[PDB]
Amino acid sequence: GLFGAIAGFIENGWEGMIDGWYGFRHQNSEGTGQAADLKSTQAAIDQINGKLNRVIEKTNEKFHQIEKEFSEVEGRIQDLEKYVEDTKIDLWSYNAELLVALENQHTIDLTDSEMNKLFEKTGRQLRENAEDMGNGCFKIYHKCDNACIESIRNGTYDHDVYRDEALNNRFQ
């Protein structure tokens, strides 16, 4: 993808995460754990639902048309009838091929984008109290107990509280 997160700097996805599309894994003093991020997950799902509903939007109702199969050889009129239908079918087949190709490239790029947005959002939250390891993980330079982790995940982490502790641990 265009943002380089999914199948890029994040080595792989997690089969264990069954309750969300994007989320968090942590290691601290109290152990390890996992939680889905609902906001990023919902933004991707909403965009994909949106495009699905636009694509399956019913627009075609036809009644009496031309004949398309013929029991007799007739020449010129029938040549034209068949050519008209064959032309139509090819143009529609092309539109169908192009549509899915564009839609799917975009779906891959927007899902890659949502991963990247979450990562960048988390980086900005942690200010000077963490460093980007380069594989989707931040090294957090302070005592971050379970309540502190949850605070990062629900957007309530005050970086100022831990800054001095973290700044000291980072700069030797």
Using the rule CB under 8 A, which residue among 46, 53, 65, 73 binds other proteins? Answer: 65
What would the x/- binding string for other proteins be over residues 102 to 121, using CB under 8 A?
xxxx-xx--xx--x--xx--
Position 87 contacts other proteins (CB under 8 A):
no
Question: By CB under 8 A, is residue 38 in contact with other proteins?
Answer: no
Which C-beta is closer to other proteins: that of 42 or that of 107?
107
Taking CB under 8 A as the rule, does residue 60 contact other proteins?
yes
- Residue 46 interacts with other proteins (CB under 8 A): yes or no: no
| Closest alpha carbon to 161 in 171, 151, 146 | 151
Tell me: does residue 68 bind other proteins (CB under 8 A). Answer: yes
Helices 38-55 and 76-125: crossing angle in degrees, nearest 10, is 170
Angle at 62 between CA 59 and CA 67, to 5 degrees: 140
Please state the closest distance from residue 96 (CB atom) to other proteins, in A.
Answer: 5
Helix (H/G/I), strand (E/B), else coil: 36 = strand
Q: Is 35 a residue that touches other proteins (CB under 8 A)?
A: no
Site string for other proteins, 126-155 (x = CB under 8 A): x---x--x-xxxxxxxxxx---xx--x---
The answer to the question of residue 43 lying near other proteins (CB under 8 A) is no
3 state DSSP class of 57:
coil
Separation CA 115–CA 123 (nearest Å) = 13
Q: Which of 80, 96, 161, 167 binds other proteins (CB under 8 A)?
A: 96
Spatial neighbors of 67 by CB under 8 A, at least 6 apart, are 81
Which two three-digit tokens encode residue 140? Answer: 């957090």
Q: Residue 115, Cβ neighbours under 10 Å: how many?
A: 23
